[model samples]
Target chain A: XXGXXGXXGXXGXXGXXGXXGXXGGXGXXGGXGGXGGXGXXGXXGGXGGXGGXXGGXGXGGXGGXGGXGXXXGXXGXXGXX
Target chain B: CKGADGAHGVXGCPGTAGAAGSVGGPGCDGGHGGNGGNGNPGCAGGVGGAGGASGGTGVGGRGGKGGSGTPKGADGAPGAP
Candidate 1:
């Protein structure tokens, strides 16, 4: 008499800048763990564990700001006397 | 004429951890666990020229823009009249 079972899951996230602008979302997944129940006769049950992992998302937004060009052209007024 | 200033943006990165489960025999099942992996985002920013003129009638300045999120910051400077 013995039992044990599962757990596993997680991964996702990345994107932002140039190309429609704005994009970054993804991350979440984790749940599993339960087992072990039963024992009689020559009893010998036990074992069960593990499950957890999920989270990754955030990275998007950066590109916009550039304007400063035009200034410098003036110095020439002295030749008439 | 005067123009120069623009730069700031950068930050993102974190995620990873999960794994554990095993051991259960004698007279039944047991074993199951594994999951984790997700994280990566940060890098973007760079663009801002320079300017300086005034020796024989100046004229030079233009370059600045870049900032939103993920390593980004630089731009501004130009004027001589």
Candidate 2:
């Protein structure tokens, strides 16, 4: 049995944790302060690499999804412009 | 047991000059020439020579080249020579 089962240097499974940051706002400037990371809790696609045989269970290519956390607003009070 | 089946020892090494045949000693001390051919590949499945009854002459098996992906997991196939 040949042995080709040791390739897995490419992890890239980092894109699911940035979706849970949307409630850090409310008391700061009175409306928005820490809640700007957009709370979608689902992120998009991941990164890539790591797959040949022993690279087994490698499917976390979700690196680009962490950048979607950019949507905050400090309007002050009741949706004021 | 009864010592009556001893006649299969003619695989090679008559000594004339060119027959280095089998010597059949079962690959002679694991081959020499500083590992001439296989770089002495090693364990690709114990060389598949497991008769279970256990011992002497016989081998086989599959797979080995996938490590070419830069993806990194294609380097485990070399168990057959």
Candidate 3:
């Protein structure tokens, strides 16, 4: 369960406070992962809240180099007795 | 499904507003009814009799709270050159 709400600064040098964490997402069929920590407010004389950071970029595509080594022949059978 | 936006930057959360206090008056016990008696004030006619007594009812109290500012980006408009 989410904990109590935390107060934060309103604006630069402002004394007002704002909500801490994002509203809990609706409970889905399965339990949702724990929400991320809320962003902190700036101190006096600071500007308003900054935009949320962009999500990480997708993984890079794999390289196209082909295999080089050849397969060794199976061990030759011993000469017929 | 799409993932949620990335977490807000280190410094971006906004502040919350404070709540106002309430104002109310205490209640008092009701008093018994009083008998009416007419008496002559001027030389001619008698003045009206006093009405029955009743306890006073207090008015409701009001509440107030501090104002909160909205979250905004740190960047400010450019100054005139």
Candidate 4:
């Protein structure tokens, strides 16, 4: 019984990696939506006038590429192993 | 005695012409609205409003000119035959 509880505690710690994926994906989704919306509308509306805005939103979405960040943290877990 | 021939009368000058009218305002172009843009992983295509109605051409009519005037008779010559 003690072995099982100890194993459960280790599994709970592994949940941290899952949390990172969820947060990053959520922000990426948000930023991508706004970026595309603002950029596309401004482009159609003013041609180049508002194109600068979308780039800022795009940075957040691009931050999603930092998904690599999760891989590194997971590596730390593996490194611990 | 033979009388000398009289000299011909001088021609009169014409009256001033009427002022010219100004040209019409520029026409409204019926050109189509500018095109649109597209998407994220799930971004959408945009719709555009139809272009405005064309402007009308302005009128520019003719002006009147003054008609010719009568001339005065010249003095008779002095020589006798």
Best candidate (score: lDDT): 1
The window of 10 residues in a row where model 1 chain A has the poorest summed lDDT is A10-19
Tens-digit per-residue lDDT, A5-79, candidate 2: 111111111111111101111111111111111223342221111111111122111111222322211211111
Q: Chain A TM-score per candidate?
A: 0.31, 0.15, 0.19, 0.16
Off by over 4 Å in 2: A1-81, B1-56
Candidate 1 per-residue C-alpha lDDT over B1-81 given as tens digits, one digit per residue, 9 for 90 to 100? 211111111122322221222222222122211222223456443323223222223333332232332444344344232
Clashing pairs in 3: A9-B15, A13-A44, A13-A45, A17-B15, A17-B16, A18-B15, A18-B16, A50-B12, B20-B64, B20-B65
DockQ of 4: 0.00
Off by over 4 Å in 3: A3-6, A10-13, A20-22, A28-81, B1-81
Note the clash tally of each candidate.
Answer: 6, 10, 10, 2
- Superposed on all Cα atoms, the candidates' RMSDs to the truth, in angstroms, are 32.2, 28.1, 34.3, 41.4
Candidate 4 lDDT over B1-81, as tens digits, reads: 000011111111211111111111123122222112222233332222122222242222222112223321111111111
TM-score of chain B of each: 0.31, 0.18, 0.20, 0.30
Worst 10 residues of 4 chain A by lDDT: A1-10
Worst ten in a row by lDDT for model 3 chain A: A72-81
**Which residue pairs of candidate 2 clash?**
A4-B76, A46-A61, A46-A62, A46-A63, A47-A61, A47-A62, A47-A63, B64-B77, B66-B74, B67-B74
Q: Score the docking of each candidate (DockQ).
A: 0.01, 0.01, 0.01, 0.00
List residue ranges in candidate 4 displaced over 4 A.
A1-81, B1-25, B57-81
Please state the error at residue A8 of candidate 2 in Å.
25
DockQ of 1: 0.01
TM-score of 2: 0.13
Displacement of residue B32 (Cα, Å) in model 3 is 44
